[PDB]
Structure 1
């Protein structure tokens, strides 16, 4: 669950809980999750955040249900993405996405994940 107050510090604490590359101490603290892998998940959400500002919710919810396909498929393979969606509660946040304000909150919640990934990188 994430509200309009806490959808950022949940996303900050999520990135800090991503377990680093403790192996191979040359250039340490790198994440198993990589940048271009995470942007694939953002490009999904950062085209619904645009269309939610223009369209209504009911003419848009077909692409919203396909996020639950994509966030599982991108995490079902290449296990470092599964490390994200279990720690950052992505699949639980898609359970509560019933309105445009929450659609614009989760699509903005993903942008906080990309922000602190780039900051703590």
Structure 2
């Protein structure tokens, strides 16, 4: 969950990451706005935001080279199919926060 996030994210390629935290404010805006809203109502009611969350990880993957190299390694599209319950979705929301904390520790 959070133990493998320190080794898989560090093992990359060339140093000096050109990607910061401002250019990734688009795909990281729906992940934080989903964990705090799925606990109020049921999971079968919100059927428009679930299908739209997968689109953000596809349209933004073919524009910048600093996006495709991270999704294929962290397996983001693989966990989008296993989830189906409200309790399972709560676990995926916590895994996204691990890829951001360890990213700013080695650089920015």
TM-score clears 0.5: yes
Can you give the 5+ residue segments of structure 2 that lack an aligned partner in the other structure?
none
Q: TM-score, normalised by structure 2?
A: 0.85
| 1:1-121 mapped onto 2 (5 Å cutoff) | 7-19=1-13, 22=14, 29-121=15-107
TM-score scaled by length of structure 1: 0.77
- Give the distance between the partners of 1:13 and 1:62, measured in 2 at CA: 35
Instruction: Give me the whole-angstrom Cα distance separating, in 1, the residues matched to 2:86 and 2:56.
Output: 20
Instruction: Provide the alpha-carbon RMSD of the alignment.
Output: 1.7
Q: Classify 1:57/1:33 alpha carbon distance in 2 versus 1 (closer, same or farther; 3 Å).
A: same
* Bigger RCO of structures 1 and 2 (CA < 8 A, at least 6 apart): 2
d(CA) in 2 for partners of 1:17, 1:38: 20
- How far the C-alpha of 1:69 sits from its partner, in A, is 0.7
Higher helix share: 1
